[PDB]
Amino acid sequence: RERTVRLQYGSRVEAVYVLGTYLWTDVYSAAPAGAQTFSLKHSEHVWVEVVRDGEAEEVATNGKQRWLLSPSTTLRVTMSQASTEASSDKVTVNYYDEEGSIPIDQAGLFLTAIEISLDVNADRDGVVEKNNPKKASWTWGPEGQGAILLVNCDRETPWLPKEDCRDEKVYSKEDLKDMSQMILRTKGPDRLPAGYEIVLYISMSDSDKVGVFYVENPFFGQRYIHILGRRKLYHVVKYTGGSAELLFFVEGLCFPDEGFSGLVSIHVSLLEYMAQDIPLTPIFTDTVIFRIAPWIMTPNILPPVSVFVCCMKDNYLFLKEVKNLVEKTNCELKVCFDRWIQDEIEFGYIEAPHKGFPVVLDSPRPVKELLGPDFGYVTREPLFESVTSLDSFGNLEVSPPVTVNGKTYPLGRILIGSSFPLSGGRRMTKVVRDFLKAQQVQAPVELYSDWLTVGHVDEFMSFVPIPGTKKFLLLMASTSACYKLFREKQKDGHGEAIMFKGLGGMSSKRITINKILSNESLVQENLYFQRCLDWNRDILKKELGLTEQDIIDLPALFKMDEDHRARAFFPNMVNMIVLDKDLGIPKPFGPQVEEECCLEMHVRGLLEPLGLECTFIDDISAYHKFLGEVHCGTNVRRKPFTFKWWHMVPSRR
Amino acid sequence: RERTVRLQYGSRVEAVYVLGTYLWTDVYSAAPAGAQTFSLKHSEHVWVEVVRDGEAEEVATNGKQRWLLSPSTTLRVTMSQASTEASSDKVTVNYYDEEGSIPIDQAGLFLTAIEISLDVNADRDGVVEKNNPKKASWTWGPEGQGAILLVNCDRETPWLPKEDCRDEKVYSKEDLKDMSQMILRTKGPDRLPAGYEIVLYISMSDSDKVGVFYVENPFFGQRYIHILGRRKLYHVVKYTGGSAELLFFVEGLCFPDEGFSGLVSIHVSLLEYMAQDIPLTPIFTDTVIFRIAPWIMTPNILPPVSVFVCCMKDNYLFLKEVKNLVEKTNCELKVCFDRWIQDEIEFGYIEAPHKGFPVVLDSPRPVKELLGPDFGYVTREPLFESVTSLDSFGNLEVSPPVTVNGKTYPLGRILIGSSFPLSGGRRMTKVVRDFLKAQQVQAPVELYSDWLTVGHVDEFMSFVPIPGTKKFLLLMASTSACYKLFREKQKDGHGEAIMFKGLGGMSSKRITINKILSNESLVQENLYFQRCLDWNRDILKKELGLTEQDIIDLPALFKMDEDHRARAFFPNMVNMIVLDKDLGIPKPFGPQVEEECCLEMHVRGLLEPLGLECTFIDDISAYHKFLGEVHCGTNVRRKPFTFKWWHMVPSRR
Numbered sequence A, B: 001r002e003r004t005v006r007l008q009y010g011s012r013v014e015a016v017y018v019l020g021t022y023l024w025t026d027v028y029s030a031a032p033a034g035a036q037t038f039s040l041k042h043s044e045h046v047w048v049e050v051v052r053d054g055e056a057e058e059v060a061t062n063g064k065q066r067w068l069l070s071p072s073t074t075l076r077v078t079m080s081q082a083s084t085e086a087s088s089d090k091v092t093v094n095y096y097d098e099e100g101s102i103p104i105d106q107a108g109l110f111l112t113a114i115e116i117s118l119d120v121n122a123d124r125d126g127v128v129e130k131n132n133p134k135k136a137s138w139t140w141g142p143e144g145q146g147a148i149l150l151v152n153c154d155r156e157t158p159w160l161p162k163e164d165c166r167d168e169k170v171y172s173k174e175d176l177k178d179m180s181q182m183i184l185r186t187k188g189p190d191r192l193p194a195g196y197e198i199v200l201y202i203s204m205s206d207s208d209k210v211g212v213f214y215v216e217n218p219f220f221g222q223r224y225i226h227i228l229g230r231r232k233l234y235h236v237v238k239y240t241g242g243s244a245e246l247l248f249f250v251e252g253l254c255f256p257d258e259g260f261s262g263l264v265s266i267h268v269s270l271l272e273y274m275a276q277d278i279p280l281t282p283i284f285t286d287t288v289i290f291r292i293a294p295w296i297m298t299p300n301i302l303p304p305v306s307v308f309v310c311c312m313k314d315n316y317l318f319l320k321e322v323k324n325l326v327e328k329t330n331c332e333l334k335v336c337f338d339r340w341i342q343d344e345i346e347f348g349y350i351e352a353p354h355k356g357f358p359v360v361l362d363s364p365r366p367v368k369e370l371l372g373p374d375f376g377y378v379t380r381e382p383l384f385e386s387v388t389s390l391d392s393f394g395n396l397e398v399s400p401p402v403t404v405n406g407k408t409y410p411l412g413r414i415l416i417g418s419s420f421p422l423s424g425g426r427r428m429t430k431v432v433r434d435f436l437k438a439q440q441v442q443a444p445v446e447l448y449s450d451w452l453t454v455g456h457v458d459e460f461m462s463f464v465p466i467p468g469t470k471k472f473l474l475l476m477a478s479t480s481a482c483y484k485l486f487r488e489k490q491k492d493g494h495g496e497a498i499m500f501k502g503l504g505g506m507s508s509k510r511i512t513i514n515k516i517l518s519n520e521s522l523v524q525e526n527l528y529f530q531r532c533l534d535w536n537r538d539i540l541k542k543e544l545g546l547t548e549q550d551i552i553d554l555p556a557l558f559k560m561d562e563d564h565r566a567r568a569f570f571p572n573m574v575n576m577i578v579l580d581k582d583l584g585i586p587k588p589f590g591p592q593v594e595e596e597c598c599l600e601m602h603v604r605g606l607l608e609p610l611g612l613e614c615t616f617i618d619d620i621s622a623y624h625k626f627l628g629e630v631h632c633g634t635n636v637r638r639k640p641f642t643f644k645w646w647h648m649v650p651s652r653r
């Protein structure tokens, strides 16, 4: 960076020189009228070139050399080391007229060199390198560069209800571990010359996206000063001489969203005092950029950590069977004593090179009771648009990593259910959709859920890993598979086999395979629902790059309501608890053949050959009947992907 | 694209097949209970594969071959040509049980194949190619692809005041020439099968960004039907059999802006009727994308077309000298009988492969009187923020094409004046700044103008081409050059030479070189203004990739007001009319030495050796005095860049 500093006619110029720049210096304007030639002297640590019409020539500390005065003959002035108290750094120019070799005038430039660098960890290793030349840019990918910031959305101490970033204060040094480091490094003499100050600042726009703290250690203990952030746009830095560092800690306050890309900037400037009533002149400015880390969902293929379960205290079979299942694994079971754990919350995570933690997304209106140390919270509330069943998080899921026609999605793709574009049907609120899209690294896909009364993708589809491989299966509800199976059992002499055996509230109904197969309107409804499933099958195959070999169909059956929307006839087996090879599967209560449920045996026959272990879990017996509704919920918290989100290269927006 | 179509148990399935897709067909669900094997027949133009667990085998039209019935044994069905009236396209499956070789049941699939393609000119040659595989994407650069749309902002007929895009109507066939073509191409039999329709549609969001028209030729003359746009989100297409094309014309309604990237989409779907009260199922969907062309500024290096001039009818010297200047060139002179032509308007342009026209940007509040055929209009009005002098377009300029540290800016970079970040000073309104940034291809740079009372970049800087080369110069106002010159003339014995000779309203002042040089406070003010100029010099060198060899300094002088802001002491020569080698330069009225203005002679000495021809133009004599204000204005309308904006690759936003 070249900077203009002119000698001044009949006076001496004093200037601060910032290392990493160089000066071009006009000596002509300061020459007396009628002066012919000039010479120069300079000190040891100042390098001086005389530049004539672009041609540069190095000059000694004291020579006698003279050059013709011309507007096109100038100096280039460079310094490679900061000034100390022992320094006198200067360039002096002598002027001469045509008569005589004694100078008729002198103009000079007295310099104080300092180093100023605002440094961050741009190379993403967790340590703050000195002046990364890429620190002012942010690039995606394995070779990409630039610093990363976490939204500090967890809560360090329980005393306050709100997340850490909702205020301007830091109470606890544990909070600093969530924050990115930024160091202002300087080198120079005991003080800045008269008329200069160093100032850190941010734009008004970024002031609700960040906060920046400095740690002081006064007499009675450590304290945390908020120097940039909400309603503080600048901070005058206290300068210390010699080689010095000021350590700052930076927190993000906001996730990327509609209208906010996630990028924020922080600046430091050296300012020069001109006079009262006149603005200070930025002499030098250094900038760093941060990208705020996106919220990321976890697919069923990722290792389970904790199984969260909600049910009534007296549903004993459910609790017993869920505990049994989890005991086969290394997971924690967490129980709360009705679908809210599935519908109101989605467990995501955030990650930066220095730290990461799980973060809950809260569905639009006691889930804020999950907020705690290294467990974060985020929510979006529609300001205008009304919430529908499609805003519930049974309608929010995510695929395993996929490659679709050469395009890699290393974090998978978010899936949310919707209605056809021209249908006038339900759709998840724009505010939530906009939020998921803005995270960018999960590239969301809309499926068709609005044929279902509740309207959730988890009613019809799920993913499971294939044990001992890197692969996975798509599981789809299928009415055609159910009808095929029941027609086979009927042919085999089982048509009088009864559904829902043991649910006392259903006994008067006596539902049999025969009764199901002879219900003509139910057949037509389910043919239509199969068309709805197949439409989804096609979009999943297209957008996930799946073939028929990647899909397994589980028998399912639905009843139609007055809106021509589907609800489960028997419990939907596809929405299941997936812990690696072990699957909690809702107990279907299907027709008994030889004292085994034919739906259970059929499902085992599909899954077991692949090394999957099935446990059927009964949530409905405590209610004595099944009306299409589920009274329990589970949500599995999983380990984050090994792949770092910042190594992705998302498509241009 | 693979699509799911199942045979139906005990019934025949009729389906439309869209060319470019293929069907995967379940034959198992339709088999009677207890059936063992199946065989198949198919017609001539239907290709059928039996796929067993992923392994595909082609099958004859009539063979006797039988396969085991399995859920994993399916059909793949493909057609390569559209159905005609002579077609019977079908696949029939026979089922058999273990006893006997006579079929016990039959299921079949009757197909009608059609071609549906929504086509645009994605390869940007002006003609609409058939089904460009990249038509649904938009990519920048020489190898980039996707269709381009103009904002149709001009006005075809004078009868209505507003721009063409402000309504839903097309009056004149000339209007269609501004529009991009889109063709829906189809092939098929006399009619679509029962229950199907084809529909064009757009999102609610895009509905204020586009309009789409169809030309009908009824009995009494050509008419224009608006089929998509404001308050019309879909249009049911009238289907014609055989090979058919429907030609549509697409207009943009809005420039890229804050919150609108410029990309819009149009879809066509084949929809299937299910039953009353149930939404129609999209069977097939095809999409095209358009990018709306940005508004682009023209730098002084581009060929002049028309010189627009505003002044009073009696300023005779001005008109005479401007006419003289323009007569040296091929330009039109257009005169309107006070700075509004410079301050209220900026002449830009828009371009698409099929057409381009100039477009005026109107500064925030009779410039709408420029609206006409192939002369467009656009404006931005702050909803809240107050307008200041910095919103005037003397504060809006653009550089010649530059390369800055390996990064090419083939259209140049927009330059607008501002104040220092921490100053609390004036800044151009956000709405206009956001608009310029959103055009993206001119990558705007803010300079420091707020040290000037009026606050415009054109007060201190301009660009000129260097004749006979591809290069250009930056011209900067310089107070140091003026002081050097005056001090030389004083030494030469000219100190009593007077400014403003011949302006009768200034005669009582008797301003001399001596009087100027001995005014101590004026010297200090101008040293400070030179620091303001030099700060700008440094930013221009950095952001335009310029060296000292690219810059010429023109003598200038300012007076300071109560706000510590500068106004011209004598007319600012840097703001000049540039027509290639010929320069209209405001007459400075400087000190006369040997009956020539020493400022004029000095400027000629700088410019003339480069092949530039200087004409000094006097706008102030008609006013008898100079107070720092200019009473005339000029704006030059230029030819667009040869480089196509779509060949640029702007940085990721």
Ligand SMILES: [Ca+2]
Pocket: A120, A121, A122, A123, A124, A125, A126, A127, A128, A129
């Ligand atoms: Ca590092």
Ligand SMILES: [Ca+2]
Pocket: A163, A164, A165, A166, A167, A168, A169, A170, A171
């Ligand atoms: Ca806090």
Ligand SMILES: [Ca+2]
Pocket: A152, A153, A154, A155, A156, A164, A174, A175, A178
């Ligand atoms: Ca925290």
Ligand SMILES: [Ca+2]
Pocket: A154, A156, A174, A175, A177, A178, A373, A374
């Ligand atoms: Ca924490």
Ligand SMILES: [Ca+2]
Pocket: A342, A346, A393, A394, A395, A396, A397
């Ligand atoms: Ca979910």
Ligand SMILES: [Ca+2]
Pocket: B120, B121, B122, B123, B124, B125, B126, B127, B128, B129
């Ligand atoms: Ca073309």
Ligand SMILES: [Ca+2]
Pocket: B163, B164, B165, B166, B167, B168, B169, B170, B171
């Ligand atoms: Ca119109």
Ligand SMILES: [Ca+2]
Pocket: B152, B153, B154, B155, B156, B164, B174, B175, B178
């Ligand atoms: Ca038009």
Ligand SMILES: [Ca+2]
Pocket: B154, B156, B174, B175, B177, B178, B373, B374
């Ligand atoms: Ca036109």
Ligand SMILES: [Ca+2]
Pocket: B342, B346, B393, B394, B395, B396, B397
């Ligand atoms: Ca302008």
